[PDB]
C-alpha cells in the first residue's frame, strides 16, 4: 500500500487567559502515534501507539525539544499575523500547520507537504515541487519573501525526501501488524418504513481501517448521488471507522436498489441488497 505521515499544529491565542495553546499531533495514515500539548502538566511528546514506544529516551527528548521550540515559534507567528492583518490584540486567533510525506508501496517519496492557515483560511503553502511557495494574500507574501531569502524550501526539501521518508519507513515496519493491515468493512442493509408509501434503505459499513471508503446506492444500475444521504466517516474508538448511505424508496421497490462498497481491505467491490 501507499502511506503517509503528517504532523498537525494548532496554535490558539486566548487574550486574558495566558499564552497561546500549542498542540501537535502525528499520524501515520489514520492512526495517531504522537501528541504534544503546551497545556499539559509537564508538556512533552507522548506515545499514542504501541509501535512508537520502541524509540529510546533520546527520541523522546529530541522530539519534545522540537515541540517546546515550536511553541515559541507559533506564538511569535500569531503576534506577527496580528500586525500583517492590522488586527486588535483583544481577539482570539488560530494558526494551523500541516506537513509530511506520502510514500508509494516501494516506500519512495510520492510527494511532500508544508501548509499554514490563519483563522481557517489558507495563508502559505509549499508547492508540490518543494522549491516554491503560494501565498494567499499580501500578508502571506511578506512571509514568502522572508522564506525565499532564508532558503526555507531547500531545507524542507532535504527533510521531506530524507528524514520524513526514513522515519515513516521505520514506523511502518515496527507497526506493520496494524499500519499495513487493512480491515474490510462489515456491511448490511437495514429497512425502516417511513410511511405507507415510502421506506428508508440504510447501507452500513462497520469495523473498517483505513478511513477511505466509497458507499453508493444505485436504482436500476444508475447512481443516486442527489437522492442519497451520506454521513461523514466517523471513528468507532477502536481504530476502526464507520459510515452509512441512505435512500428513501417507494414501497415495494426495494429490489431495484443496490448498495455498492469499495474499500482497500476488499479484493473486489461489493454489491448488497435489502435481504428480507
Amino acid at each position: 500500500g501507499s502511506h503517509s505521515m503528517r504532523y498537525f499544529y494548532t496554535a490558539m491565542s486566548r487574550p486574558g487567559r495566558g499564552e497561546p495553546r500549542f498542540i501537535t499531533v502525528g499520524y501515520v495514515d489514520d492512526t495517531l502515534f504522537v501528541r504534544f500539548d503546551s497545556d499539559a502538566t509537564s508538556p512533552r511528546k507522548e506515545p499514542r501507539a504501541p509501535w512508537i514506544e520502541q524509540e529510546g529516551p533520546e527520541y523522546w527528548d529530541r522530539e519534545t525539544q522540537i515541540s517546546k521550540t515550536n511553541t515559541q515559534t507559533y506564538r511569535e507567528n500569531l503576534r506577527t499575523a496580528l500586525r500583517y492583518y492590522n488586527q486588535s490584540e483583544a481577539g482570539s486567533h488560530i494558526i494551523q500547520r500541516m506537513y509530511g510525506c506520502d510514500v508509494g508501496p516501494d516506500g519512495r517519496l510520492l510527494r511532500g507537504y508544508d501548509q499554514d492557515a490563519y483563522d481557517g483560511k489558507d495563508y502559505i503553502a509549499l508547492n508540490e515541487d518543494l522549491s516554491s511557495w503560494t501565498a494567499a494574500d499580501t500578508a502571506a507574501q511578506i512571509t514568502q519573501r522572508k522564506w525565499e531569502a532564508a532558503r526555507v524550501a531547500e531545507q524542507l526539501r532535504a527533510y521531506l525526501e530524507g528524514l520524513c521518508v526514513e522515519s515513516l519507513r521505520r514506523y511502518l515496519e515496527n507497526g506493520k501488524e496494524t499500519l499495513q493491515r487493512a480491515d474490510p468493512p462489515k456491511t448490511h442493509v437495514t429497512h425502516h418504513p417511513i410511511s405507507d408509501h415510502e421506506v428508508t434503505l440504510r447501507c452500513w459499513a462497520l469495523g473498517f481501517y483505513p478511513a477511505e471508503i466509497t458507499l453508493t446506492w444505485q436504482r436500476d444500475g444508475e447512481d443516486q448521488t442527489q437522492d442519497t444521504e451520506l454521513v461523514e466517516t466517523r471513528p468507532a474508538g477502536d481504530r476502526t471507522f464507520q459510515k452509512w448511505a441512505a435512500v428513501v424508496v417507494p414501497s415495494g421497490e426495494e429490489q431495484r436498489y443496490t448498495c455498492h462498497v469499495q474499500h482497500e481491505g476488499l479484493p473486489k467491490p461489493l454489491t448488497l441488497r435489502w435481504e428480507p
Binding site: T24, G26, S67, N70, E76, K146, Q155, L163
Partner: peptide, 9 residues
C-alpha cells in the same frame, strides 16, 4: 519524526 526547524512569519 519531526523537522528540527520551523521559521517565523
Amino acid at each position: 519524526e519531526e523537522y528540527l526547524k520551523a521559521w517565523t512569519f
